Amino acid sequence: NLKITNVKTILTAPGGIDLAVVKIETNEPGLYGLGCATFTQRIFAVKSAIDEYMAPFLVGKDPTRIEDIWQSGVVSGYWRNGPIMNNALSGVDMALWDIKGKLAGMPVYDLLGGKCRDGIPLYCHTDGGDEVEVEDNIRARMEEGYQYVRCQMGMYGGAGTDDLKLIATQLARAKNIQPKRSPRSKTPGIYFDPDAYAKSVPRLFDHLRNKLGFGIEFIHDVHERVTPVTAINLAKTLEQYQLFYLEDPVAPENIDWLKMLRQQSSTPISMGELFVNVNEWKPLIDNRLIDYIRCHVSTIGGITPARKLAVYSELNGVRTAWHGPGDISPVGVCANMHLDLSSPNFGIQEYTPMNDALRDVFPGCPEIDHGYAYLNDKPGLGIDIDEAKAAKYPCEGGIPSWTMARTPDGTASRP
Amino acid sequence: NLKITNVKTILTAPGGIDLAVVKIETNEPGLYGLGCATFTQRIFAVKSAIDEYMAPFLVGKDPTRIEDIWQSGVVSGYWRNGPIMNNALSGVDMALWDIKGKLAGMPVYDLLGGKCRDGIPLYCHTDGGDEVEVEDNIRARMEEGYQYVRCQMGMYGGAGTDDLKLIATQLARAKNIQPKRSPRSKTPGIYFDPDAYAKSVPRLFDHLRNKLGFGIEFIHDVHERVTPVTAINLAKTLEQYQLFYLEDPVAPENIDWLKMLRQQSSTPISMGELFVNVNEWKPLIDNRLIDYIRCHVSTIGGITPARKLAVYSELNGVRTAWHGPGDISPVGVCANMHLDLSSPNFGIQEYTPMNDALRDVFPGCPEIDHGYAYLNDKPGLGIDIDEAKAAKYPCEGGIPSWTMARTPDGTASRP
Ligand SMILES: [Cl-]
Numbered sequence: 001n002l003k004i005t006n007v008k009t010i011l012t013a014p015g016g017i018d019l020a021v022v023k024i025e026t027n028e029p030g031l032y033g034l035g036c037a038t039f040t041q042r043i044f045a046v047k048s049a050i051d052e053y054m055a056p057f058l059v060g061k062d063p064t065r066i067e068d069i070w071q072s073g074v075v076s077g078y079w080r081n082g083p084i085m086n087n088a089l090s091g092v093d094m095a096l097w098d099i100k101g102k103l104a105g106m107p108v109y110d111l112l113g114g115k116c117r118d119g120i121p122l123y124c125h126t127d128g129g130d131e132v133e134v135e136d137n138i139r140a141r142m143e144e145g146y147q148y149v150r151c152q153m154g155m156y157g158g159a160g161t162d163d164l165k166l167i168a169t170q171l172a173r174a175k176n177i178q179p180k181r182s183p184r185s186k187t188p189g190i191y192f193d194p195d196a197y198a199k200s201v202p203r204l205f206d207h208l209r210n211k212l213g214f215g216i217e218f219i220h221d222v223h224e225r226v227t228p229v230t231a232i233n234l235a236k237t238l239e240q241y242q243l244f245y246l247e248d249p250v251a252p253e254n255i256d257w258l259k260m261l262r263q264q265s266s267t268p269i270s271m272g273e274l275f276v277n278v279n280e281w282k283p284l285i286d287n288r289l290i291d292y293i294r295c296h297v298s299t300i301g302g303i304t305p306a307r308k309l310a311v312y313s314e315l316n317g318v319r320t321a322w323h324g325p326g327d328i329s330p331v332g333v334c335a336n337m338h339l340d341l342s343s344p345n346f347g348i349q350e351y352t353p354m355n356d357a358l359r360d361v362f363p364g365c366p367e368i369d370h371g372y373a374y375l376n377d378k379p380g381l382g383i384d385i386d387e388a389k390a391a392k393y394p395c396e397g398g399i400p401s402w403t404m405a406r407t408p409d410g411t412a413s414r415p
Numbered sequence: 416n417l418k419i420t421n422v423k424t425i426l427t428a429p430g431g432i433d434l435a436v437v438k439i440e441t442n443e444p445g446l447y448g449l450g451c452a453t454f455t456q457r458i459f460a461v462k463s464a465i466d467e468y469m470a471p472f473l474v475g476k477d478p479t480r481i482e483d484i485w486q487s488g489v490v491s492g493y494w495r496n497g498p499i500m501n502n503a504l505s506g507v508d509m510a511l512w513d514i515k516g517k518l519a520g521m522p523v524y525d526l527l528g529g530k531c532r533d534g535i536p537l538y539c540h541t542d543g544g545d546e547v548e549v550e551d552n553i554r555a556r557m558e559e560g561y562q563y564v565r566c567q568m569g570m571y572g573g574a575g576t577d578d579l580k581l582i583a584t585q586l587a588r589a590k591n592i593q594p595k596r597s598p599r600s601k602t603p604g605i606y607f608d609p610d611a612y613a614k615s616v617p618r619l620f621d622h623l624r625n626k627l628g629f630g631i632e633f634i635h636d637v638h639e640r641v642t643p644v645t646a647i648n649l650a651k652t653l654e655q656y657q658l659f660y661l662e663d664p665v666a667p668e669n670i671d672w673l674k675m676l677r678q679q680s681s682t683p684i685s686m687g688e689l690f691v692n693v694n695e696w697k698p699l700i701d702n703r704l705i706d707y708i709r710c711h712v713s714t715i716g717g718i719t720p721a722r723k724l725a726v727y728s729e730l731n732g733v734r735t736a737w738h739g740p741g742d743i744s745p746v747g748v749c750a751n752m753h754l755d756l757s758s759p760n761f762g763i764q765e766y767t768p769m770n771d772a773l774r775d776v777f778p779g780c781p782e783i784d785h786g787y788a789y790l791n792d793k794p795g796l797g798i799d800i801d802e803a804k805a806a807k808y809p810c811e812g813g814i815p816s817w818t819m820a821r822t823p824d825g826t827a828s829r830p
């Protein structure tokens with residue numbers, strides 16, 4: 001007669017980025033589950049969604065009924081399909097998977113069908129103010145054993161970032177990108193020039209291919225920064241550089257434009273870190289408009305819907321590339337990886353390296369060894385949280401600044 | 416030098432249903448705006464989204480720049496397109512429209528282009544345990560001057576409701592619908608039989624058209640309760656009864672099925688009270704798969720996005736029917752109606768009659784006279800809130816019961 005007894009939210013920032021973790025307790029002594037609910041920009045609203053709504057929904061129920069709980073949970077507020085709602089559901093769903101693995105004495109990847117590969121290949125982020133600094137940073141990552149890298153010159157749209165809420169790191173604006181002149185007064189924002197950015201990208205990859213060759217795999221993230229036809233043209237101009245993928249050429253609001261892109265370009269495309277709705281990803285995958293699906297697993301509602309998405313992708317020849325930024329807890333990192341190891345159609349795993357504090361707060365972080373991640377074989381997600389240590393890193397709260405992105409004339413843009 | 420000085424949430428339940436209202440104060444003495452943020456099932460998370468995120472985003476800004484504030488606010492948390500996020504934005508957006516009207520000395524409908532009609536026709540809800548009870552209820556509403564009515568026998572799926580969080584009224588289960596026998600043990604939920612429900616609807620309308628004739632307009636709400644092909648067959652069998660519309664024959668997750676429905680049936684269709692994402696409504700409107708769009712204005716982000724939706728619908732010959740349940744504040748009722756008065760493609764206004772406490776807490780409620788609503792000509796939304804009186808009706812909070820809908824075998828179903 002196993003029952004959920006308690007559900008709680010833990011808010012912690014050991015890597016300098018606000019995280020939300022759900023812990024689900026049961027009436028079996030010592031048996032609990034952990035899940036990721038990290039929507040970093042709205043952590044307090046996520047906490048409210050869990051504590052005020054998911055907790056009374058769950059206490060008393062048999063945690064082994066993961067699918068029933070997910071299906072009933074998703075419709076429990078009637079309205080649904082949003083990032084706050086989905087993250088609250090995810091924390092619950094991953095915790096239940098964690099509990100199921102612990103009961104079975106099996107890692108989640110074994111519950112899901114077992115290992116389809118011997119390690120998880122990773123990509124990491126490289127940046128710089130000019131092409132030489134990017135090149136230097138790639139060399140350093142290659143020395144560490146990375147065989148795949150994302151290359152940005154000036155973060156997103158060439159703008160860099162001063163906002164530590166984004167990745168806990170300041171990144172330089174592109175040094176030599178010359179923006180258009182703005183009007184005589186400016187509304188506050190982080191200014192960028194989408195056209196100057198777009199033209200800089202082929203020049204960057206020309207330099208990088210010249211210096212580093214074609215063995216190393218390259219990723220570039222457009223991050224919805226340009227008009228769709230500009231993104232199409234960029235995809236075409238980048239064909240010669242043979243990117244592993246070109247990421248987020250359009251906003252989710254503009255997914256129809258991928259119909260045109262895919263008639264003209266053979267540069268591999270990834271989309272979807274922003275997706276929260278089946279009506280965003282289903283038309284893309286059904287029509288083969290992408291080669292990699294990029295969802296943030298917690299933001300689509302956890303392991304249960306991510307595995308459905310992985311299967312839907314697999315049957316259409318689309319591969320997975322789950323979102324792996326700084327704004328994901330080590331629990332969510334483990335969840336991505338259990339999916340990765342058990343999916344036939346795994347593509348790549350984006351990885352943001354952790355500091356000592358994250359490894360200390362979350363015992364059981366995956367082993368990173370020469371560009372591959374190696375999950376432990378402990379039951380469930382193989383991850384724990386030290387609640388006392390978590391409390392040493394309280395969340396900063398507040399609002400980000402980087403999301404106020406303005407084009408030269410002052411237009412508020414999708415960031 | 417006009418600036419926003421304070422943004423706050425008011426939670427009140429004068430009609431027995433939890434409401435969320437946003438009040439935006441400015442540095443001009445006595446000038447403020449009110450907006451609806453009512454997502455009733457998640458009011459505390461909406462409150463968190465406003466108080467922790469919208470408030471610091473807005474203080475100091477010029478409230479006259481409604482579009483800039485909307486466009487920048489919607490992407491401020493990066494992830495977007497969800498019911499909690501959108502309601503927080505709506506509260507702000509409607510309050511800014513209210514402020515703009517007050518500054519202009521004109522109602523919002525006048526800022527939007529003026530009256531397109533002389534009054535707003537309404538439909539109200541009628542229910543009953545059997546056909547004769549529904550008939551009697553319709554007669555009573557026709558005597559009050561309603562010329563359009565929604566007709567349900569047992570609320571949604573024939574199940575009725577005992578949950579006061581839904582519409583603050585207990586409604587009888589359909590008396591004569593015989594469900595399939597369930598398994599020998601049952602998981603808790605509100606049980607219904609989709610097939611017994613579906614067969615009962617044509618029988619209801621056969622009775623109602625015989626007794627009441629064809630002058631009176633009838634609406635029926637399927638409320639996502641049946642399989643898509645069952646919905647298609649229902650639409651076909653109801654053609655002879657000439658419904659004003661058949662509402663929500665499919666879930667948002669199943670919108671593709673409307674392609675098949677519209678090849679076979681000429682029953683008018685409405686969809687969309689559940690919509691939160693452009694990728695849900697845009698394919699429907701682009702392909703003329705519905706005749707009326709049903710969005711809950713606050714849940715799509717306020718007046719700014721609702722006006723865009725109304726225009727997009729107008730150009731495709733689709734008409735508006737904004738959601739008008741019990742779970743919308745009188746501020747939201749006013750916002751619906753200002754859109755209604757100024758839209759060339761207005762279709763109908765669903766209306767849930769208010770009690771004395773709602774009228775007392777919210778001075779300026781629209782005048783209801785013989786089946787039409789008559790907005791006052793006061794500036795902005797023409798509505799106010801008495802905060803001291805609102806405080807006499809604290810919110811109940813908690814989670815609803817009705818959203819746990821199960822079919823005879825125990826399957827958790829979209830409610
Ligand atoms: Cl949301």
Ligand SMILES: [Mg+2]
Nearest residue numbers: 221247248273
């Ligand atoms: Mg990205």
Ligand SMILES: [Mg+2]
Nearest residue numbers: 636662663688
């Ligand atoms: Mg409805």
